[model samples]
Target: MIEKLRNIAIIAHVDHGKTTLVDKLLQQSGKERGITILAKNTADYRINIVDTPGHADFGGEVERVMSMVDSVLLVVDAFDGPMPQTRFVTKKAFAYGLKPIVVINKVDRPGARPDWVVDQVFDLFVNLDATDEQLDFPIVYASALNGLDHEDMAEDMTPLYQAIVDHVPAPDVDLDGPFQMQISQLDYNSYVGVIGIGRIKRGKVKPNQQVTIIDSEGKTRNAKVGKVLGHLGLERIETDLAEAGDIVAITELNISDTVCDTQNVEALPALSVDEPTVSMFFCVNTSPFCGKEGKFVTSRQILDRLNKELVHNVALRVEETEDADAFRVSGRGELHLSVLIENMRREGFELAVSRPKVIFREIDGRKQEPYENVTLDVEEQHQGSVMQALGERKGDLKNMNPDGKGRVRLDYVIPSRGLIGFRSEFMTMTSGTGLLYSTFSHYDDVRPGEVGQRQNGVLISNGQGKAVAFALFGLQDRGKLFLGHGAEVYEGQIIGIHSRSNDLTVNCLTLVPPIRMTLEQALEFIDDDELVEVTPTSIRIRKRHLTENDRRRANR
Candidate 1:
């Protein structure tokens, strides 16, 4: 039974087309989510394919999901070559002993260099200390966006299907052994409290079968399988029995009481997640505009939502604060925390977030901070400024090389705090031609002196009303504005950055033309005296002090 199945996952950097590749494969092969359709010499294989998050902040997802598979499909952009996330996920794959099948996606895009990308990928493998056998990976060039795939280029994904059958090894499990399955990812349905999903390592499971769940702490709980479901396309099809090597979803157990590892005889090893590097305050939205838009705006509602998130969000850590209305939520990076906040907002939760601060640790009686391996791809003309900026933040250069066509790739190790708000400036310096990616590398003693911080001040609204075009146009000389004319604003809200280093209070009462900037720019431009207020319908920046008197008193 195990020999008839193949399990693999797709790994790539953000925007490298892994999702698109998966969509193409599914559509062409008439397969379902998490299920792969395969054809090989006189036989067909039922393959389970896991799609992983590509962001460096979500590397934990990639790391844990790899345990469920035996190989990985490494997707690389034909034009960008090997990127930061590509290196990060590929390194994890090698460590897990998962063979890599390099997919050079977007081969039909302009300026695509599949051959050069292939060479660069090999170098990346060597840099990650991949073994000789790992280095001998098969390459498949395709344009995932247009459903084109082949060793060269074709209109269909048949070549990719064939590659998986040949490169990805079938799961090896002992059918005679006791039932064992380690949960790699969790799913929740209102009907079933918690559903644990993973591959069956040994034996078979049936619907309503009695089983024993062994947790990581050596605790055992008796439970029965409510349902044994197998993945087909987009939906889970209930089955009478699921054999070894098949990915299964088991219901009838609460994850909070039991760890992800569950077995009938002996527990398998528990999965470990990366520690959170940054933390921020999640407080009841006490702004003047609070409760005007969101439904879940109370401390109790927010706390319940966060606790519920802990059931499945492995990378998130929430701790109660001195104030009952506030909680300190920590996560891997800004993107990680932002995703959580964004989800909450869309769910009608109203919360105020503080500036993201690095979580410091004391080790050997010395203060320590997290460090990251940052990789940058920028135009050759912007290399000098980018290097200088990172240097100012105490970054140590690791490597530098020309990436061809007037672009250079630079690598460095920098303090995690150094990148808190640097992306905006990096984009500006590179004229939006820069690509930045970072992965948690290690923790070292805290870097001495100041790290990254906003250089300009912000313009805070003293009085609340629809922004006036006349007033905003008048203030254009001060700095960039965050909102356009007729946009609703509140007292103490930040309307724009100030050209000077000191915060200035202004009025928002005119029918002014609204100003706009990229959302990342709006987020990164936040000053120490400011906070970004995110909601389901709006995103606004505001001052820590809501009144002119409050600002005066604080400054004094």
Candidate 2:
């Protein structure tokens, strides 16, 4: 056996401090220096932290990394208690037969209840059918944002470093066996090309050794290792050999293959993830103002960007459509797909995406949909609005009880689609006083009907041009505004919600045709064919048809 071998990963809901704790562990363990991007003009030494977003919608990222390690560090928010993603990830760790080191972070926040939170975790363990041994999992209290933690505040304020060393088991590997490694993460290096990072589960390897990667389909390819690097802290150090259980990065392994393909075996079984449950159609932006913002404006550039994500992110699976300009991108949920868009936007890419839709599965000859268990924490005064909103979305209230701290806790079972775009509305309904959390519940028979979606039609720009203030002021009485003066707009682009429930097209051009009357009377005369335009600077409302008779016939 390779003495002292242990590999662990961290999981938690969004903003629960998993990355913070990881940073601390890597720092105290002398593996990384906390490095962060500050001023663009100046730089500083910060911890190199691998961060996964906390939203339940992005659970795929966390799930794929599970196979890379032997255990998990389940960090949970002290005030928030057990959330949906928290339950989902922790259950995955247990399913893999990995004991967790429970970290209750943010203990310093007001309303933080350590004792009650601990009880809730234990109850969750029992509810999830955790075994007696698993229920005895270790606990550590920490405040990752504050960069401090203690095992027991009641006894003494000890730092989190000692607790990690004491509770987290060391890596255990069998060095005598043939070399076996699972590629956990893949990233591109400008100098080294594609680099695979993973832990050697057995034996050892050196530079220039012949290797084979066992793909998920059980196919194997030959490659030669060029460089073997080990993590000294955050930065990797070139090493002659990486023993079993040691995390290493290898380059010069023939990577003209697939992203996330298993490396080093012909017969070894392949690791697979649950197929994506949410998907969206992405198309090149075709608005009147398409090319104004991003450099990657064409369909080819968009397709290549989507294809490249398959490398480091194993959770995402992309497919080509019949139309070369469009691609079907699928992942766990909205946040999962949105993060990709967010990253792309930062890189100066322009594209438009359809709303998220769920992928259905057949069970017992019946169609089943993805469901969620959403937990709401709100003041008593706003309970009515929250209930009414969720009720309209077909949310079935499972539990309603007071938190015994002047607030109400409501749990509901709702379809995943019902929750999309609900966050912004929920905050408005609660007036910023309520807290909302959710996790994946199981697949169930499709809900009786459609859950929730924006009921009103969107305000579409008619002709392509910048929005003007004069036209917007005329349309203000019709509906709410989503753009200001001189904003770039397109003919088919959605600018704002239509005051009515049905779609109405408009244009924002400023050409004045010859009027039947004088200048004063003509100013009030708008051609029914025109539409208001929306731009980054302005929003102008106009008629759909350029001519009055065409508008009348079109409306009829």
Candidate 3:
């Protein structure tokens, strides 16, 4: 009891302004910049705060960090209440027996409803099966961006800090017992090799100490702890030792491995996460215009990059395919895989990706596929367009009600693949005013029929030429053109969508909310016969086989 300690983690669904809340707390304590990367740690007053991701795709980030702290600061929006992924993470935190302190944030935004938000949160908690003791939680109203807490005109975060210190219980551990820590994150440094980060469960550790690494499979490996480092804001400073309840980074570690005293070797249960639900074929770009923009454009470069990503992304999977140039990359969901694709493209890697497919499994000799609980809120007038679109995708309407603001709120359960290319259409149907969110729900028996397949055909270019308006003038009624005049195209490139089911050949040229294709949109827009050619400087669409006879031969 000599040291007064309080360790708490900050968490919220994607984009709830959690980082701002974490930044405000850090600014008052150490005046240091907060790093949104990893479950970072900091301590000056013995109040260790670990920051977490808001995106639900990385729900693993919220789950594993729960082991590092005794309580959580569940930052939810004042109006949005619990978000799509928030319920999933909060359920885990309670199951881990971590106390939760509610932070009703974004009160300054329009449509503030402090009381209503609390009620919604309570309803979520009840649904998660919270006990009487867990039902009671302390609440803090905050506008994180303005650093205001308790709905007051203040410049400091004292009340929020005080609530955490007073309400959250201290971590009870065997301080003088044998050392133990379940490595939640894996990092590498050029000087020390592997840097394992986690909270010390019991006892203490130091540099150059001999420890036994107990793996997930009850296997033991002996390694010397090297270069012990402690967090000072985002920077890790060299430390001689780190004690119980302290978040430290040590050497020779991997995911789901535990470090224990060499003499007393007992492994802890491995941390768990949802398996990869979505996967795509990540192949090197083979388009004729591939090498002109990207620096890394080979199979070796692509493999090395995929391997590099596997080190940090726990919910990600990479496997070799029959084709050496193509690797099957799987992740938790669409955002998870799309985020990786976006990053690689931004890093100057040219690659072509196939449409995302849901990874199905056989449970108890029964086939199963992943599904999502998608909630959408749109104006009453736009409900018809939204409903018809979802119905075509085989979305099951679970709940439909009024939002009390001239808007209808609908909840639908849809197969993972059904929502792949639904976003662009959704935005267009609602005129960009609808708010839609979906979280991975559960795995069930595979549904019937083809879902979310593109309804219209496309225009393929057979002639290599610069697109001219006069050449496209006669083909105006054929379909929508991707690019206007003066655009360069190849022999087997996609230039537009056709009005009917059959594919058409354009002798000449190619927006409805202007279909403005970004990386995500392009990734979702293509079909099995097409590919999205990605480069650092450009993103293009082309046929998989860039010749008429080649595609014709393969069709047979």
lDDT by candidate, in order shown: 0.66, 0.54, 0.68
Instruction: Give me the runs in candidate 2 sitting further than 4 Å from their true place.
Output: 1-273, 404-406, 509-556
lDDT of 1 by residue, 1-556 (tens): 3566677877755574454666545442342244332322222456567766665434365676776788888778888887877766777788877778887877878888877887787776777665665534568777655633344455546766777767777777665555556656555544333446566666665443445553313333423343222333233233221221222234223222223224446655543544567887877888887788878887877776776776557676666665888888887677777788888878887777777788785456667887889999998989889998888888899999776877899999999778777787788899878988777876689687756686767778877678777788888678887787677777788787788886777886853344554334555566656666776677777766788888789985
lDDT of 3 by residue, 309-412 (tens): 65668677666676889988887888888888889988988888887777885566657787899998899999998999888788889999786878899999
TM-score each candidate.
Answer: 0.54, 0.49, 0.57
Cα deviation at 338, candidate 2, in Å, is 1.1
Error of 2 at 199 (Å): 17
Worst 10 residues of 2 by lDDT: 36-45
lDDT for each residue of candidate 2 in 204-232, tens digit (9 for 90 to 100): 66443444443323223323343221233
Provide the global lDDT of candidate 3 against the true structure: 0.68
Off by over 4 Å in 3: 1-57, 61-271, 509-514
Candidate ordering by TM-score (highest first) = 3, 1, 2
Q: Report the poorest 10 consecutive residues by lDDT, candidate 1.
A: 239-248
Measured with C-alpha atoms, the lDDT of residue 256 in candidate 2 is 21
